[PDB]
Amino acid sequence: ERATADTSPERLAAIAKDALGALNDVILKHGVTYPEYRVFKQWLIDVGEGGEWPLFLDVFIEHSVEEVLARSRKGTMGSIEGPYYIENSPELPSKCTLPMREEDEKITPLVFSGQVTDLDGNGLAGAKVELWHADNDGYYSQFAPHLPEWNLRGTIIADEEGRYEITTIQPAPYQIPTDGPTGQFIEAQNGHPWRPAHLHLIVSAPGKESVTTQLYFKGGEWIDSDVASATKPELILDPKTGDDGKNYVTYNFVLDPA
Amino acid sequence: ERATADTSPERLAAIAKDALGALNDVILKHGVTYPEYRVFKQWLIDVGEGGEWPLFLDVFIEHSVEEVLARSRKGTMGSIEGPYYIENSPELPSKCTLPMREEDEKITPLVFSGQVTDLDGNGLAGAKVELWHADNDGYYSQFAPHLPEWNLRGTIIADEEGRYEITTIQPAPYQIPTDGPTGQFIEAQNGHPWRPAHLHLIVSAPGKESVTTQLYFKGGEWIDSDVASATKPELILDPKTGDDGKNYVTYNFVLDPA
Ligand SMILES: [Fe+3]
Ligand SMILES: [Fe+3]
């Protein structure tokens, strides 16, 4: 139930030494003061009392952890998970619409097509696409009590050829939660709390290395100034609008061997 | 009631940028992994749930905050406060014994003499010495329910000449609390959790800059390997034993103008 790793005492000793040394160096570089130290201590306590460690770490730290993993991989680019992924979302056939409310129906549709392939571009049987994203108000299901537990969440079962056609709503930018210690941190430095419009996805196939990633939208606000530093040029979509007024886009996933 | 500072949005923006950048650089230098990231997130949450932010920060971070303050000062060396200082401890006359239990009486006495002076060595009227320290079991009053609220704590009123003669018990090394996330951190890297034997003191006088500091004992265990990195050569005492079997030492305090 609790996370574990095999990091030797020696490896942790070297990590800790550098990380503590770097922080101490910043204190010495900027002449950090005792009143500043006191504010910083109270702020660390407020983050914990506020349930905001997942939030703060995934905004400010996760992008480097993904950058490390990215060195080992040759397939589709990864991006950060973020704190809103939920396992075992209900399966949907390869052409489907995600579960949504009447209000969600009022949003311009997005029709997302593509194929899960291996590094050589051959289509993969047994592949699954797990999709989750925010509604037009910037809310995620299971992290807003008013929403049905699986709003805009599903496990898409790709066909024999690894193909999928998933219709949903067109994502919109949103602000991360700003009524706690993280919004305070951002407001005290004259920052902004916005992420660009995006889809979240986890893509898998028998005997393949899974990929966690995000997909963004050409010309969208906040792509060049994401608070989470999680956007990459290779992950920006360019949907074309239909005569039915729906947004259409094709995007393929490419998986490394396990 | 809550700590405050005047740090401009610009100054905080520069501090944050460096501090976040340094941490991200460590992740990239050591190839920190996703399971390592998950352990680190759970550990930050455990520190907060455990009431251990004062502990962890004062062991691993405070010594740099004091090193900053030390640049501005010419008097007696400072050291870290640590998390156990309590304000308004009961006043005692210039020659006194600290409050203690019968058990404490069984410990070799320590008789601490000296004078509070200005930078030119002139003795100061109105000077106070606030002393607090651990008992022979490594416990601090108000942070162990079995002890009287002011065990080994007092506000010493120096004489007209700034002089004092304070008798107490001879301090002993102790381990910091190790049954929580901080002891876990230390145990996973093959570290040790010991501080050397020490007195804690805050010394003041009308219109003077106060000094927070610690005093240590020549040849004592753990002086060269303090977990808190808080010892300095200039703060090591060399008590001489009497024919009464008590330890005797003289030490002067030297205060900067406010
Ligand atoms: Fe998101
Ligand atoms: Fe102490």
From Swiss-Prot, chains A, B:
Keyword Metal-binding attached: yes
A UniProt-annotated Pfam family: Dioxygenase_C
Record text on cofactor binding: Binds 1 Fe(3+) ion per subunit.
Cofactor dependency: Fe(3+)
EC identifiers of the protein: 1.13.11.1
Biological process according to GO: catabolic process; catechol-containing compound metabolic process
Recorded superkingdom: Bacteria
Reaction(s) catalysed (UniProt annotation): catechol + O2 = cis,cis-muconate + 2 H(+)
Binding positions (Fe cation): 140, 174, 198, 200
Enzyme class label: oxidoreductase
Keywords: Aromatic hydrocarbons catabolism, Dioxygenase, Iron, Metal-binding, Oxidoreductase
Molecular function via GO: catechol 1,2-dioxygenase activity; ferric iron binding
PANTHER family: DIOXYGENASE, PUTATIVE (AFU_ORTHOLOGUE AFUA_2G02910)-RELATED (PTHR33711), INTRADIOL RING-CLEAVAGE DIOXYGENASES DOMAIN-CONTAINING PROTEIN-RELATED (PTHR33711:SF7)
NCBIfam families the record matches: catachol_actin (TIGR02438)
Family: Belongs to the intradiol ring-cleavage dioxygenase family.
Protein name: Catechol 1,2-dioxygenase
